[PDB]
Amino acid sequence: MPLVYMNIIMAFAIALAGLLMYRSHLMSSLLCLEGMMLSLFIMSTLIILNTHFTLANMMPIILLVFAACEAALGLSLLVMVSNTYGTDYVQNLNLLQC
Amino acid sequence: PGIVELPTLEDLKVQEVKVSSSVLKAAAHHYGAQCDKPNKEFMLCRWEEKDPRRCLEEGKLVNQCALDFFRQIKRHCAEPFTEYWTCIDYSGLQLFRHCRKQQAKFDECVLDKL
Amino acid sequence: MTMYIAFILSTIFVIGFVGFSSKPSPIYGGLGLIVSGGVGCGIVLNFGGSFLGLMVFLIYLGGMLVVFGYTTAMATGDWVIYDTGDSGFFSEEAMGIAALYSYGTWLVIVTGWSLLIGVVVIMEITRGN
Amino acid sequence: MNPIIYTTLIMTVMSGTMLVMISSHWLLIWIGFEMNLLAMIPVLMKNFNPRATEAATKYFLTQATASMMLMMAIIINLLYSGQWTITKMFNPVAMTMMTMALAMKLGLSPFHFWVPEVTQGISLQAGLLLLTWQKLAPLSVLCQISQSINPNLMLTMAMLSILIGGWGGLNQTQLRKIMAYSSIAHMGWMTAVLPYNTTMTILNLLIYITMTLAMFMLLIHSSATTTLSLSHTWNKMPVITSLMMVTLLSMGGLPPLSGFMPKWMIIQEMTKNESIIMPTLMAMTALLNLYFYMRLAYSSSLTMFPSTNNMKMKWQFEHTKQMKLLPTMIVLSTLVLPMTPALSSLN
Amino acid sequence: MWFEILPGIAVMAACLFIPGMATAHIHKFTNGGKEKRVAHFSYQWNLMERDRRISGVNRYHVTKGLENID
Amino acid sequence: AGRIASFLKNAWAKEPVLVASFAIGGLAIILPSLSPYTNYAIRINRATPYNYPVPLRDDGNMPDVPSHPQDPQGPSLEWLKNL
Amino acid sequence: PFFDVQKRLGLDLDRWMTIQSAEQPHKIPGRCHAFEKEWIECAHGIGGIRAEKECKIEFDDFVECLLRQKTMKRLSAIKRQRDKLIKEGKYTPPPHHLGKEDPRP
Amino acid sequence: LFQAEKDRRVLQMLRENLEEEAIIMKDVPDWKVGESVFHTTRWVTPMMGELYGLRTNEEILSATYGFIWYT
Amino acid sequence: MNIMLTLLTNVTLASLLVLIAFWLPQLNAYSEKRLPFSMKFFLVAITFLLFDLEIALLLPLPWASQTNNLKTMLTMALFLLILLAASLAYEWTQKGLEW
Amino acid sequence: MFMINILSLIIPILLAVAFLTLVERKVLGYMQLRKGPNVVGPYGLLQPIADALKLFTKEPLRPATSSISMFIIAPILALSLALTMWVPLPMPYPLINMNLGVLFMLAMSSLAVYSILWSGWASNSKYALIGALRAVAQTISYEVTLAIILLSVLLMNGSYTLSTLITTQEHIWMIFTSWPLAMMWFISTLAETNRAPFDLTAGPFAMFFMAEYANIIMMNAFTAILFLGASHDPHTPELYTINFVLKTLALTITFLWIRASYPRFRYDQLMHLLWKSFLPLTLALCMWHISLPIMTASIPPQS
Numbered sequence A: 001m002p003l004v005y006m007n008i009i010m011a012f013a014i015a016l017a018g019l020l021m022y023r024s025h026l027m028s029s030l031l032c033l034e035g036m037m038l039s040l041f042i043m044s045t046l047i048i049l050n051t052h053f054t055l056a057n058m059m060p061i062i063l064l065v066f067a068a069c070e071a072a073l074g075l076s077l078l079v080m081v082s083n084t085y086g087t088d089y090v091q092n093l094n095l096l097q098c
Numbered sequence B: 001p002g003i004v005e006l007p008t009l010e011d012l013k014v015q016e017v018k019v020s021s022s023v024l025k026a027a028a029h030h031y032g033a034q035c036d037k038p039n040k041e042f043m044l045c046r047w048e049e050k051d052p053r054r055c056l057e058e059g060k061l062v063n064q065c066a067l068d069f070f071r072q073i074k075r076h077c078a079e080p081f082t083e084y085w086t087c088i089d090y091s092g093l094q095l096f097r098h099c100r101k102q103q104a105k106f107d108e109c110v111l112d113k114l
Numbered sequence C: 001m002t003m004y005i006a007f008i009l010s011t012i013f014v015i016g017f018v019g020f021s022s023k024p025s026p027i028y029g030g031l032g033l034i035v036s037g038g039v040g041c042g043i044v045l046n047f048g049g050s051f052l053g054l055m056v057f058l059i060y061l062g063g064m065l066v067v068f069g070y071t072t073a074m075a076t077g078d079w080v081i082y083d084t085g086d087s088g089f090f091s092e093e094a095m096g097i098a099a100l101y102s103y104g105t106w107l108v109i110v111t112g113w114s115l116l117i118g119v120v121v122i123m124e125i126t127r128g129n
Numbered sequence D: 001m002n003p004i005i006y007t008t009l010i011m012t013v014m015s016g017t018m019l020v021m022i023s024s025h026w027l028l029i030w031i032g033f034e035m036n037l038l039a040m041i042p043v044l045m046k047n048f049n050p051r052a053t054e055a056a057t058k059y060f061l062t063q064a065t066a067s068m069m070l071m072m073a074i075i076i077n078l079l080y081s082g083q084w085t086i087t088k089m090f091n092p093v094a095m096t097m098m099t100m101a102l103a104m105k106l107g108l109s110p111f112h113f114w115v116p117e118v119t120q121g122i123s124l125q126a127g128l129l130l131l132t133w134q135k136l137a138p139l140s141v142l143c144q145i146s147q148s149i150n151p152n153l154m155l156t157m158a159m160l161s162i163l164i165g166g167w168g169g170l171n172q173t174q175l176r177k178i179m180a181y182s183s184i185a186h187m188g189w190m191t192a193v194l195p196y197n198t199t200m201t202i203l204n205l206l207i208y209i210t211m212t213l214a215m216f217m218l219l220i221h222s223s224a225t226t227t228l229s230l231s232h233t234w235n236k237m238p239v240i241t242s243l244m245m246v247t248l249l250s251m252g253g254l255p256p257l258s259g260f261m262p263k264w265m266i267i268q269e270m271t272k273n274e275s276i277i278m279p280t281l282m283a284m285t286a287l288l289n290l291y292f293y294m295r296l297a298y299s300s301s302l303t304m305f306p307s308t309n310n311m312k313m314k315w316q317f318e319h320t321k322q323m324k325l326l327p328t329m330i331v332l333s334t335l336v337l338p339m340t341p342a343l344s345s346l347n
Numbered sequence E: 001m002w003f004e005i006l007p008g009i010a011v012m013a014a015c016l017f018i019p020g021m022a023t024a025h026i027h028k029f030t031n032g033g034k035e036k037r038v039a040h041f042s043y044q045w046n047l048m049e050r051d052r053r054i055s056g057v058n059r060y061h062v063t064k065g066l067e068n069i070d
Numbered sequence F: 001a002g003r004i005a006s007f008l009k010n011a012w013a014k015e016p017v018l019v020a021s022f023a024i025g026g027l028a029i030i031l032p033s034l035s036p037y038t039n040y041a042i043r044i045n046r047a048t049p050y051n052y053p054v055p056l057r058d059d060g061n062m063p064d065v066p067s068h069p070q071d072p073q074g075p076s077l078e079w080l081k082n083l
Numbered sequence G: 001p002f003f004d005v006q007k008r009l010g011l012d013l014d015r016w017m018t019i020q021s022a023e024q025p026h027k028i029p030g031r032c033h034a035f036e037k038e039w040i041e042c043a044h045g046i047g048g049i050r051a052e053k054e055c056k057i058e059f060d061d062f063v064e065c066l067l068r069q070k071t072m073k074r075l076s077a078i079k080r081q082r083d084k085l086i087k088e089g090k091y092t093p094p095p096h097h098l099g100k101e102d103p104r105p
Numbered sequence H: 001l002f003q004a005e006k007d008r009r010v011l012q013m014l015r016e017n018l019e020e021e022a023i024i025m026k027d028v029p030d031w032k033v034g035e036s037v038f039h040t041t042r043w044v045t046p047m048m049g050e051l052y053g054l055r056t057n058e059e060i061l062s063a064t065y066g067f068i069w070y071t
Numbered sequence I: 001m002n003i004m005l006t007l008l009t010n011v012t013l014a015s016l017l018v019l020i021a022f023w024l025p026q027l028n029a030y031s032e033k034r035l036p037f038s039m040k041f042f043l044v045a046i047t048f049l050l051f052d053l054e055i056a057l058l059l060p061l062p063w064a065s066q067t068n069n070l071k072t073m074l075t076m077a078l079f080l081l082i083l084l085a086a087s088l089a090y091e092w093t094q095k096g097l098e099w
Numbered sequence J: 001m002f003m004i005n006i007l008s009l010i011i012p013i014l015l016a017v018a019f020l021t022l023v024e025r026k027v028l029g030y031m032q033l034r035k036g037p038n039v040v041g042p043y044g045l046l047q048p049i050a051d052a053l054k055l056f057t058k059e060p061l062r063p064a065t066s067s068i069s070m071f072i073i074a075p076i077l078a079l080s081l082a083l084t085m086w087v088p089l090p091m092p093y094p095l096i097n098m099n100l101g102v103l104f105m106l107a108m109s110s111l112a113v114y115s116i117l118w119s120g121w122a123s124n125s126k127y128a129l130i131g132a133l134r135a136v137a138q139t140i141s142y143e144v145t146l147a148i149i150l151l152s153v154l155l156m157n158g159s160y161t162l163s164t165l166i167t168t169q170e171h172i173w174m175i176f177t178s179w180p181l182a183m184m185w186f187i188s189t190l191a192e193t194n195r196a197p198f199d200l201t202a203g204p205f206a207m208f209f210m211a212e213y214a215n216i217i218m219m220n221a222f223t224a225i226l227f228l229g230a231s232h233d234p235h236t237p238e239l240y241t242i243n244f245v246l247k248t249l250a251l252t253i254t255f256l257w258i259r260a261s262y263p264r265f266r267y268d269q270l271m272h273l274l275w276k277s278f279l280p281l282t283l284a285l286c287m288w289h290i291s292l293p294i295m296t297a298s299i300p301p302q303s
């Protein structure tokens, strides 16, 4: 497993870590999710092209589309959250508690 | 686990055909029509053995037959053929369509000659 | 060997990823993600994925991150593992992608249904009340 | 929302779950998970209020993170072996990655934090859907790859889930959070037997689904979301409270009721694999679940809490809409112990 | 009158004349007096590489005709 | 029958773009299934050689496979040239 | 769990995209087609545990074809030894490596 | 003809690499010259780094990215 | 390399021109003296994103036309476009394209 | 000699967009019963030089509170994209020959909105932010139908290669095969560049102006290649170059014609125009052009 794959998994790791740190600004959480998807697409495309798996060339497209769909969903939710509070801050979602 | 076996450099020595891609393209149809049998030997053996190390003799045979074909072409119609390949070389995509007139000459020459 | 161009591109990828992972000023995070996406599409293009890299550059950058920036503005080692043979008189990536309509009938059906349901769901959520 | 739209969304959720269940390609399983998540959000937000929106946002974030982790695991498994089929995982890193992904999807501890809040925010029907139907696809995926999972991580997370559910159920006054913690504990019980027997997992899943369906339908029939609001039901329909008390006793694993069937069998199978300490710990921990079920029974049926005058008008009305299969769910979740050996049907 | 617009337009035309024509001459100056060979699909690229190896001067456009067959 | 014709009239006025779009869509949907040249297009797609035709080893029991390209046996592409 | 609807109805909904050696368009082969074919033939109709204990050689060959860890390690060792020996100054590189030597079609 | 020339060229590069590896590894204790990394004896198509590994960087970059970068 | 060099040249020339434009007039001494969050624009952005995803799905058609499964490819492409038109119609009739 | 080729591609485009301002002014004046600039120079032939020097000598107004970073990035990106767009164009031989030239141009046009977005954000004004959001939404909305029309038209070409469009139109123009698509494409190109009737919105301003006008000439050249094909003789490319330049000039003069001939739309009016008249018809024509080669057995060759 070469060094470029190491770099891409490392980028995915930083994206996941940044998603889990949660300073504020849920939009940053969506950005971290979307960077995770971009890293997934990059690594999957590299794997598929290196091994010449022809029929697997569909898988990136599909994945991208689905993730982008999820992106829209998140944005919509974010907007509604903002409409309730005026800001997309993380701490404003403290109504429900354990 | 094991040692790979590779043929010696002497076994890969053969009189390579030394024409450009345009020259090969110009005579491609006659090359396929005339040199078909050794080419089919080589291709069938290559697709059956799945081993480059077991297909050297047929490669030498197809090179020899191609050399024979080009020697005949040079002997019989050097002038007609030269004009035709030259036209092909000029085109960026090496299109047959662009210079039909040259082809009519070469073909008839070959039809008269060989 | 241009000093491991793929390695340099990967390093810039990780650099942009850690730049936007600190989550400063979400517009700046989007800028870092733009740079990272461009670098990754460059990685794909240099590897040989012309159409998939151009899909990244078109879809991702021009629609998805553009919508992200729009909504934000609303608010406040290589060369060794490579191949040896040729592809023929075409490109394997394009044929594999275009085989979607011949082989991936199930994939097209499920993806189209998901897209239509997504449109419906977006309208449902954005209605409000 | 529009009844046609609601039916379409429900069918889309069920179709995504079925696609996960009947597919053999990893990308199709991921697509089914994405479809389920995409169609689940409006269902959680059918009744619009800030609570529902916040719960839906929490659920979406958790499920999107879990799906990203699952796709990363699939990509790693493909990288170390060019395979897309759902089989042996061929890699330990991919296995632990997708193990945590499925644990987060199922709400198993330590990924249990979202379950009580998402259940509390959404309505009773959406809570029923979330706690019953949304457990089939991840459990099916786990059952398909049970030979590759590391027993240590499975057992640790299952024991943590049971302990956390038992401890957290004690401090709750809201019934929906009680249901969420009960679901967490039962999920730990289901998961603790996956490395040994998936048939036990499926049997426990069926029993738990029947019990929680009966309990949720009883809670919908008597529109109560809190212990105090539930304490008033005896003055309008005591039969409902009596059936509820019997079902609550069953949910605690008390013999000869139905809830004793899974635990017993699970314990037996674990003792077949020379594991004695863990089943004992799980039983003594489920004692806490039984304790808070008994407290709810005390506050529900075995004693008569004070009532209100305005209940008299409620005496003059009958439920216009009646749920079907509720008697069947209660009977199945209470009195099917003598037909225990039927589990040989590989349910 | 209206033909007084023509001078500036002419300049524009001259400007738009320069790039493409220049490229053509460039492609004729660098590719041995012929069109620049296009290479998609990786087969004609192999043809160009073989021509470069055959020529002996490390230039693909130096064609070796029949006189090189001996 | 009168209601449908009246609806088509009312739609052709004050809504011509939608009428044209629906007409073109219906024609594009229905016409290919009854056009006789789709089989010709399929046959043309079959006739394009992208790969090398690998010959078969002879065993003296294949009278239909030609031994040389010029041999009369095998598929004939005269139909395409006549088009 | 797994409801094998495809095998019951003979549908082939998603089995065409599972493996490299399964009917690629235009007969384009995978990079490790033969290795995966051999592994599948070894492990077919035997079960999981027996496939893992008995078809270990085929899977090792397939994974080596996929990732080329051994080949890269050997090439890196050769490169390291040649670089060290050239730094010491006892080996002179051949003309073919230099690129001075003429190419063959 | 292109196929035949390709096999001959690839075999020649492999033979030269074997000769230089044998020259290079005369002194290392546990090495074996021209040893395969596969259990099987079937022919395996060599990688890009197997043929051009011991050659110059200019030809390495050519053989790797010539078709990709040619425009 | 050629595309890299072209991009580098364009970027360098643009940077030089902008730098000169911003600095040449800066050397001579001179005087040197909300909430609304409209939803319709967000909706149009979202539907643009969804239609862009469907366009991305539709893109490989020029190579999809040479497959020997002409009936299947034609049916699948017409199905994709029918679903696209259905999404547009659904957004139209539910008052989703209004101002 | 590649750098010389790049320079000989770049500089003439800058000179052409320099003199296009004078051509537009003179054409508008003569269409308005007056003259254009005819005093500074023999026929205003030195007017662009005077305007360039005057713009390059005038003080720039930094808002004193704006973010400098994106404020300076935006014109660089705009001008770089405008100059990069010309690269794949075959006239008749492209500087860089790409397989997916059309996809490259589409991706760069998609990138083009980022300059507008960043300039709007960096203005530090709510009104300018509203205007920028409005323009970005319009641009992406018309980009949708741009992409759909482009793919439906290329379905009769066989590939995304730009040079093959010359071979495709060897005998007939594609204006005859699909004039409705060309009509909608012309209107969409008018809409993308914020030109009349869709134009609802010193140094950096000058750079943005060059980017916009280079985009205009680019779009006219692309339309001319796409729909008004010329005959290319490999033994004389100058004929194709002259034909292409003349058609591009005709299309640009036509752009000035619609600018001088009509009033402008409202924003909701053009949004409704697109989403309720072009998109349905565009989808119908996309299905029609998908089915047409199959039903007539005239599928383009390359794959």
Ligand SMILES: CCCCCCCCCCCCCCCCC[C@@H](O)O[C@H](CO[C@H](O)CCCCCCCCCCCCCCC)COP(=O)(O)OCC[N+](C)(C)C
Residues within 6 Å of the ligand: C102, C103, C105, C106, C109, C113, G013, G023, I069, I072, I075, I079
């Ligand atoms: C049997 C049960 C029916 C009721 C249950 C339905 C469940 C939900 C509906 C989805 C299931 C539909 C089955 C379609 C599976 C796709 C595969 C099958 O159709 O065969 C294909 C045939 O394709 C068909 O044309 C598919 C057309 C069906 C799609 C049209 C309508 C889609 C509606 C489905 C539901 C979508 C949402 C609701 C819409 C109203 C394969 O083509 P073929 O060429 O042999 O082989 C290709 C492989 N090669 C290349 C190696 C040779």
Ligand SMILES: CCCCCCCC/C=C\CCCCCCCC(=O)O[C@H](COC(=O)CCCCCCC/C=C/CCCCCCCC)COP(=O)(O)OCCN
Residues within 6 Å of the ligand: F011, F015, F018, F019, F021, F022, F023, F024, F025, F026, F029, I082, I085, I088, I089, I092, I093, J276, J279, J280, J281, J283, J284
């Ligand atoms: C079966 C084939 C389907 C696929 C082909 C279609 C391709 C794409 C076309 C559809 C795109 C989206 C269409 C969305 C329809 C929206 C309908 C609607 O709600 O609009 C109404 C207006 O339109 C209607 O009244 C409903 C549709 C009217 C009928 C349209 C044509 C019906 C079919 C005609 C052709 C039939 C087939 C051809 C036969 C001709 C002979 C060959 C409201 O208008 P407002 O903008 O709100 O303004 C009102 C205030 N003044």
